[PDB]
Ligand binder design. Structure first.
Ligand SMILES: O=C(O)CC[C@@H](O)C(=O)O
Ligand code: NI
Ligand SMILES: [Zn+2]
Lengths: 349, 12
């Protein structure tokens, strides 16, 4: 009953609700936000993660990537070519240059049409996956560098750092730069804050319909699926909404504006593109509900360096009564994507 | 090892 349309919801927390992060996530899930697989959270007007973004021109983007895209009829494959390092000011000059700047347009639908029509032309540069944060160290609310969720158990118990997952990543985008369809590593949650600049548009498939998308993708790229079952985790696959609609895959879209947060939920597939020069900060996080997803996540093993997280510490601590069975490989739990996370019980009475 | 890796995808 809580958002049975499974559409993307937007929330407006007061400063008081905003202070406790994991508690608010539990709240929006009690409101059915997780069903769409993506949700927007507009922070209270008083809140600000940083006083000014005018002192970062010398920040270096170590490995910018040029996005070469090949495809047709709504199905594409993206090849990220690493380019020489450059500073933000240099990236900005190129981003706003006449060659890569956002084309003129009226409504969003028009820009979206131009994106899908020209994505294989004039390959843009994306300052993606950059180690770092732009938050001021005194910001305690929704600080992406320290969210305080159970995902912290990984670093606290194994002392293992997985950059981008338990640490923040910055993304400097320009017109037409894209992020392919995927769910988070280990099917975790993700938080994405657009610090400044032009918008970032998103597409999302309800977690309860995720398999349908995987099925559809496997059909479009049989060779890729043959080489790796979780090939989508390679983050190279682009699929247009027209193709999603044509094959009956449910989905929704939303545009994130500067100063707004986007939360992706476990096993929630998403993809998108940047409208123009901008900067976003992202990382992963977890809740008790994620644990079962982590245990059942289909992983990529055809490549080195892929993110892998042992679920042993979570099962042992949060599901001690199921731990022995699980180790024996006999845990047959079935995930119900509609159910909110346990921490939400508080808001359901 | 059981836990490790990096979020950044392999580039070309
Ligand atoms: O900004 C991007 O490149 C996409 C980020 C999105 O995949 C996320 O989960 O934060
Ligand atoms: Ni993502
Ligand atoms: Zn793979």
């Amino acid at each position: 009953t809580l958002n049975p349309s499974a559409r993307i919801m937007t929330f407006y927390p007061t400063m008081e609700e905003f202070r406790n992060f994991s508690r608010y996530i539990a709240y929006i899930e009690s409101q059915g936000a997780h069903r769409a697989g993506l949700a927007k959270v507009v922070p209270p007007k008083e809140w600000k993660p940083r006083a000014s973004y005018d002192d970062i021109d010398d920040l270096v983007i170590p490995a910018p990537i040029q996005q070469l895209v090949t495809g047709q009829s709504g199905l594409f494959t993206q090849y990220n070519i690493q380019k020489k390092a450059m500073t933000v000011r240099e990236f900005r000059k190129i981003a706003n240059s006449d060659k890569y700047c956002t084309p003129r347009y009226s409504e969003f639908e028009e820009l979206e049409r131009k994106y899908w029509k020209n994505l294989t032309f004039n390959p843009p540069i994306y300052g993606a996956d950059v180690n770092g944060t732009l938050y001021e160290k005194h910001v305690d609310e929704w600080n992406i560098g320290r969210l305080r969720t159970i995902l912290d158990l990984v670093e606290k118990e194994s002392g293992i750092t997985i950059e981008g997952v338990n640490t923040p990543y910055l993304y400097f985008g320009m017109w037409k730069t894209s992020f392919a369809w995927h769910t988070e590593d280990m099917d975790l949650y993700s938080i994405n804050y657009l610090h400044f600049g032009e918008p970032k548009s998103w597409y999302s498939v309800p977690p309860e319909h995720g398999k349908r998308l995987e099925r559809l993708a496997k059909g479009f790229f049989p060779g890729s699926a043959q080489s790796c079952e979780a090939f989508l985790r390679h983050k190279m696959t682009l699929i247009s909404p027209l193709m999603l609609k044509k094959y009956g895959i449910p989905f929704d879209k939303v545009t994130q504006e500067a100063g707004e947060f986007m939360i992706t939920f476990p096993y929630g597939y998403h993809a998108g593109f940047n409208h123009g020069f901008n900067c976003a900060e992202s990382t992963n996080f977890a809740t008790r509900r994620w644990i079962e997803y982590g245990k059942q996540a289909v992983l990529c093993s055809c490549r080195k360096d892929m993110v892998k997280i042992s679920m042993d510490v979570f099962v042992r601590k949060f599901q001690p009564e199921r731990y022995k069975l699980w180790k024996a490989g006999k845990d047959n739990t079935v995930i119900d994507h509609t159910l909110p996370t346990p921490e939400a019980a508080e808001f359901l009475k | 090892p059981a836990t490790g890796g990096v979020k950044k995808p392999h580039r070309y």
